[PDB]
Amino acid sequence: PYLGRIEIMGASRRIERIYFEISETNRAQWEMPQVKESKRQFIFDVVNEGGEAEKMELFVSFCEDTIFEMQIAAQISEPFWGELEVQRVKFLNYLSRNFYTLRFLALFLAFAINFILLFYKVSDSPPNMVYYFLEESTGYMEPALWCLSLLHTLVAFLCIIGYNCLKVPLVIFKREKELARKLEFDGLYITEQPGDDDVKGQWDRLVLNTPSFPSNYWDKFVKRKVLDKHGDIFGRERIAELLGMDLASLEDVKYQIWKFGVIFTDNSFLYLGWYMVMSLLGHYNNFFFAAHLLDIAMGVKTLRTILSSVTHNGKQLVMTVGLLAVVVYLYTVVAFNFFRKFYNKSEDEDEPDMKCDDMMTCYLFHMYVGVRAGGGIGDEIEDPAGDEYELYRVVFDITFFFFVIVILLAIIQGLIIDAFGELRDQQEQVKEDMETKCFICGIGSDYFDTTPHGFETHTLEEHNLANYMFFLMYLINKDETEHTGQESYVWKMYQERCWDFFPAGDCFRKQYEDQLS
């Protein structure tokens, strides 16, 4: 239960098995459903849109993110300026622990507000100017709407605060983590400099000189390592002034501005801010509470997966909608040049309403009524029977119907129908790969299945990606002086970002098969 077990490619160039102790708190945090869903999403992403070369780097990044999330969860968990500080941190922890409940409550409140909004009525007379007011016999909905609007605004504000307390630390952690990696192993601001059209790199400069650069990232030796790696070649004084460190120490408005910039560029934070703004506009005009019904797309995973079918081929949907416009424009040109006499949409004899005596009017008429008509433009425009251009006109109508109504809408619907099957195939392929190959070492399940339940044992004990994350957390928490020999070996390999200690293509059984059996 607490006894951990991983296999590494040891210094002796052989597979070695490492035993360590796992904390019950870490095990419970791992078993939490949020972490389970995060792991599933990561596995899907790497199997689907990932390369075999970078699989271990991606896996280590996932492990680091999961470790930081567990640390934040442990921080927010629960068992005269001091009094207000204690109360404030308690309130913030409560908001962080109930962020998702607050989001669900906000969705419910929006639904209730809109259901009450379904009873609004418009009258010229008071209960030019028109008076909008509720019309219900019960009388409870009129105060209920005001109470629910106040509650919805409060819940939206609490959701913003909870997000800032919970999911912003991870964004800042990843940002600082990536900046440190690029600074050390790429010399981004020492050797190359950013692209300059890269908004992120330019903003990141503001934080290099700050004393609190590794505020969330664990490694506090980021600057010292970069100095040792680069200063000897590129100027010790220049590196020190760039990184804002003092060279005689061997015996933050800018940081806050940079942090706020990252927060304001965060997509989920922007979405929650827009949600709060619309909730505020709701008190101005209650029908602005109808823009919070769009939150179901982010709320319900089933609806999100359904809409993913539409958005999988969204670029091609836009392309085919823009192609429909060009085809209808060509039909408009032909109509305006040759069949102007059929586009009289006025029943009155004396005054004619000619829809194709102007190019813009004809194009609007086509794109409006011809596309939405069941049989095309022939349904709307005048019948050509007994006319000189009857055959040209019937060819016009038939080709419009076939190319636009039939073929183009068939393409639009086939894109969605194909997107459904493509997403299904992606899920099936990920499942098949995860059930027929080992993630860490990439050895087929047939080899392990010679022993009954061999692949199950290999994926549960020998090569467990949960155990690897537990070992990484163990190394990070353990002291450098306290590290044992193999732990120091793996720690050095991790510090140099060398993923060669992961057994790739080899395992304990494959190495000692002759002796074991």
Known binding residues for caffeine are 218
φ/ψ region of 386 (left if φ > 0, alpha if ψ in -120 to 50, else beta) reads: left
CB 344 within 8 A of CB 384: no
How many Cα atoms sit within 13 Å of 470 on the Cβ side? 27
Q: For the CB of residue 129, give the shortest distance to its own copies in the complex, in Å.
A: 14
Q: For the CB of residue 360, give the shortest distance to its own copies in the complex, in Å.
A: 6
Q: Does 463 bind Zn ion (CB under 5 A)?
A: yes
Q: For the CB of residue 421, give the shortest distance to its own copies in the complex, in Å.
A: 6
CB 405 within 8 A of CB 374: yes
Judged by beta carbon distances under 5 to 8 A according to partner kind, the member of Zn ion, its own copies, none in contact with residue 440 is Zn ion
Pick 196 or 347: Cβ nearer its own copies:
347
Pick 277 or 391: Cβ nearer its own copies:
391
Binds Zn ion by CB under 5 A, chosen from 377, 438, 465, 472: 438
Number of H helices, E strands in the chain: 26, 4
Pick 397 or 462: Cβ nearer its own copies:
397
Judged by beta carbon distances under 5 to 8 A according to partner kind, the member of its own copies, Zn ion, none in contact with residue 463 is Zn ion
Q: For the CB of residue 438, give the shortest distance to Zn ion in the complex, in Å.
A: 3
Q: Does 56 bind Zn ion (CB under 5 A)?
A: no
Q: For the CB of residue 392, give the shortest distance to its own copies in the complex, in Å.
A: 13
**Residues annotated in a binding site for Ca(2+):** 481
Whole-number Å distance between alpha carbons of 438 and 504: 10
Judged by beta carbon distances under 5 to 8 A according to partner kind, the member of its own copies, Zn ion, none in contact with residue 438 is Zn ion
How far, CA to CA in Å, does 175 sit from each of 70, 181, 214, 340? 18, 10, 10, 62
Residue with tokens 């908004």: 199
Q: For the CB of residue 388, give the shortest distance to its own copies in the complex, in Å.
A: 15
Judged by beta carbon distances under 5 to 8 A according to partner kind, the member of Zn ion, its own copies, none in contact with residue 364 is its own copies
Residue 226 tokens read as 């970069």
Q: For the CB of residue 440, give the shortest distance to Zn ion in the complex, in Å.
A: 4
Judged by beta carbon distances under 5 to 8 A according to partner kind, the member of Zn ion, its own copies, none in contact with residue 422 is its own copies
Q: Give me the phi and psi of 250, to 5 degrees please.
A: -95, -5
Residue 339 tokens read as 């069949």
Pick 415 or 441: Cβ nearer Zn ion:
441
What is the three-class DSSP state of 5?
strand
Pick 151 or 411: Cβ nearer its own copies:
411
Please enumerate in sequence order all residues whose Cβ is within 8 A of that of 15, keeping only pairs 6 or more positions apart, or say none.
Answer: 7, 8, 9, 503, 506, 507, 508, 511
Pick 103 or 509: Cβ nearer Zn ion:
509
Q: Give me the phi and psi of 124, to 5 degrees please.
A: -70, -40
Pick 165 or 438: Cβ nearer Zn ion:
438
Q: For the CB of residue 485, give the shortest distance to Zn ion in the complex, in Å.
A: 24
**Residues annotated in a binding site for ATP:** 36-40, 434-439, 459-465
Judged by beta carbon distances under 5 to 8 A according to partner kind, the member of Zn ion, its own copies, none in contact with residue 363 is its own copies
Judged by beta carbon distances under 5 to 8 A according to partner kind, the member of Zn ion, its own copies, none in contact with residue 247 is none
Q: Give me the phi and psi of 472, to 5 degrees please.
A: -65, -45
Please enumerate in sequence order all residues whose Cβ is within 8 A of that of 145, keeping only pairs 6 or more positions apart, or say none.
Answer: 113, 116, 117, 134, 286
Judged by beta carbon distances under 5 to 8 A according to partner kind, the member of its own copies, Zn ion, none in contact with residue 401 is its own copies
**Which of positions 439-458 make contact with Zn ion (CB under 5 A)?**
440-441
Pick 423 or 475: Cβ nearer its own copies:
423
**CA-angle at 323, arms to 321 and 325, nearest 5°:** 75
How many Cα atoms sit within 13 Å of 331 on the Cβ side? 27
Please enumerate in sequence order all residues whose Cβ is within 8 A of that of 42, keeping only pairs 6 or more positions apart, or say none.
Answer: 58, 62
Whole-number Å distance between alpha carbons of 64 and 499: 14
DSSP state string for 164-206: HHHTHHHHHHHHHHHHHHHHHHS-IIIII---SS-HHHHHHGG
Judged by beta carbon distances under 5 to 8 A according to partner kind, the member of Zn ion, its own copies, none in contact with residue 158 is none
**Which of positions 308-327 make contact with Zn ion (CB under 5 A)?**
none
Please give the biggest Cα pair distance in the chain.
Answer: 105
How many Cα atoms sit within 13 Å of 86 on the Cβ side? 4
**Which of positions 329-348 make contact with Zn ion (CB under 5 A)?**
none
Strand partners, 7: 17
Q: For the CB of residue 119, give the shortest distance to its own copies in the complex, in Å.
A: 6
Pick 352 or 444: Cβ nearer Zn ion:
444
Binding site for Zn ion (CB under 5 A): 438, 440-441, 463
